[PDB]
Ligand binder design. Structure first.
Ligand code: FMN
Ligand code: FMN
Lengths: 195, 195
């Protein structure tokens, strides 16, 4: 009962895997633009789209990033031809007059700092979900990484900005032995119930 | 430079919209099963997949849900043939010996309650993004809802369970006048930069 055809199902989900090694082949800016142009449409609360991205391309910036990556993740991050650092824009409310223009008081739903931060991180995580699918849609492999120090990455790449660094995503064509055996997924009956 | 074909791009993102009205047509359990079977493969940190789902299908449960939904969202939530309530399993570390078996001490990364809650919510948000794409992959329309009282919903549908209710998703075939004009999206140059 799926409308999405099987080949698309395989590319995005069924045969898509997290890459642990990458080919060094350069990933072009035009490639990432095409991915963003596709998945920017994925919905966020009040269209608030708080995700901001820094493409850590140069060896210089990659070495600066690696000092904040846990040792067990440095192999992958160092070998990826492209690394995306995602941060949640804590000033997203200021964009709502133009992004959610028919509710002019929308920004004020987030006057509380905790509510603003929690909404920024939640919708940036939502967008990370879209982004992972978008990377796969671009024929590439995604290797998300949470084992890093967000404060150091903030100082390094977003100094003085009102953001919350949330994620690192290795992007590239897979290298040799990039994939380990698929791990378990919970059964439907363990996850879903009806009332 | 997208490997995903154009028809799939349109179904999942480019021509997919958030539905504000729904046809009453019943959505069967097998339909949701096919959707979960597809998007359960979407990756989460340490394979921790904390999303848990209650399908609020019956009128009885829907009325109980609606008391916790903000006035301005009751119209949508009441008319959807199916509503999914998403919660983050705060006890997900207990499942890691099984789900992330090659790292037996993984669960101790979440000894701290805030670290555990933040991880549960972040990865449930990731899974919500996959789930939205999956609902569209199933030929349906998704209508996510954040304007509700999470504690009230927890008491109704997850009483005494160690979860954090995070999101409501209206699911169905779209009704008449389900969609308004697409809103703006930030430019690539506003979201992404390189170093
Ligand atoms: C996490 C999330 C929460 C949302 N909560 C509400 C809500 O409470 N009320 C509402 O009317 N729409 C809600 N929406 C719908 C968004 O406003 C909508 O998806 C966004 O404006 C983009 O619209 P589009 O998908 O048609 O392009 C929510 C969307 C998301 C992603
Ligand atoms: C948010 C997130 C953070 C992750 N962080 C790490 C990490 O720090 N180190 C690592 O080796 N893998 C990391 N991963 C990869 C996950 O372990 C992996 O995606 C999961 O085990 C599923 O693998 P699969 O896509 O091949 O099925 C992360 C994945 C996600 C989604």
């Amino acid at each position: 009962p799926l409308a999405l055809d099987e080949a698309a199902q395989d590319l995005l989900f069924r045969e898509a895997r997290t890459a642990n090694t990458f080919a060094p082949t350069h990933i072009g800016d035009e490639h990432i633009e095409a991915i963003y142009d596709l998945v920017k449409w994925g919905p966020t609360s009040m269209n608030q789209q708080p995700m901001r991205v820094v493409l850590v391309r140069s060896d210089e910036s990659r070495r600066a990033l690696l000092q904040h990556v846990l040792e067990g993740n440095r192999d992958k991050v160092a070998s990826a031809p492209l690394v995306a650092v995602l941060a949640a824009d804590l000033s997203f409310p200021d964009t709502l007059p133009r992004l959610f223009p028919h509710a002019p008081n929308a920004r004020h739903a987030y006057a509380d700092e905790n509510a603003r931060r929690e909404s920024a991180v939640f919708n940036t995580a939502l967008q990370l979900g879209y982004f992972i699918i978008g990377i796969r849609a671009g024929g590439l492999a995604a290797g998300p990484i949470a084992g890093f120090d967000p404060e150091g990455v903030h100082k390094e790449f977003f100094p003085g900005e009102p953001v919350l660094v949330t994620s690192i995503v290795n992007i590239g064509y897979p290298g040799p032995d990039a994939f380990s055996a698929r791990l378990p997924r919970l059964g439907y009956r363990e996850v879903v119930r009806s009332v």
